[PDB]
Amino acid sequence: RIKVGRDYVQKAQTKEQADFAIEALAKATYERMFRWLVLRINKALDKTK
Amino acid sequence: KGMFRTVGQLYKEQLAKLMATLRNTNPNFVRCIIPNHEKKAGKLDPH
């Protein structure tokens, strides 16, 4: 669901487009997980003084 | 001509945007009927 300029409309997606979207979503999820892990490691290492 | 347009183009362009919005939804049609043209209550015209 994305707006074409005014109102919302259900855009169509093909097989290749759906596969590319799934791949991009998985990549973004993995990147966010790695970033969260790095942030947690930094916080645990930077908690003394 | 494009800088002036006409009244017919406004309704055609304005109505086009309205019809395009209803197609992207679930219309719930409600048919309204009038019994008679004499504004009388209770009387009905079969024709």
Side-chain angles (χ1 to χ4, degrees):
Chain A
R1 161 160 176 285
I2 188 167
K3 70 210 289 286
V4 73
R6 290 130 289 283
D7 302 276
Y8 294 90
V9 52
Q10 308 219 337
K11 192 162 183 277
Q13 293 287 267
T14 47
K15 181 177 172 288
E16 283 75 23
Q17 286 175 287
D19 285 327
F20 165 76
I22 286 280
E23 287 181 0
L25 286 165
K27 286 185 291 192
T29 308
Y30 205 86
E31 197 226 315
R32 290 171 169 287
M33 210 209 73
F34 200 84
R35 198 194 308 161
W36 180 95
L37 187 71
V38 175
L39 291 158
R40 187 67 171 81
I41 290 157
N42 291 338
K43 197 194 293 300
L45 292 163
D46 284 321
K47 66 188 286 192
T48 65
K49 289 179 178 179
Chain B
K1 299 180 178 178
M3 300 53 252
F4 309 135
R5 316 196 76 191
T6 56
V7 181
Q9 285 187 11
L10 271 169
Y11 302 155
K12 184 165 165 53
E13 208 285 322
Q14 197 190 9
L15 185 62
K17 158 163 198 323
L18 172 55
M19 301 295 292
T21 292
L22 306 180
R23 293 169 187 286
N24 307 29
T25 66
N26 186 58
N28 303 262
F29 304 97
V30 182
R31 316 307 304 194
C32 311
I33 307 171
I34 167 157
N36 66 79
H37 282 310
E38 315 302 338
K39 311 174 191 174
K40 294 173 177 169
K43 191 191 168 189
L44 257 80
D45 207 306
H47 280 326

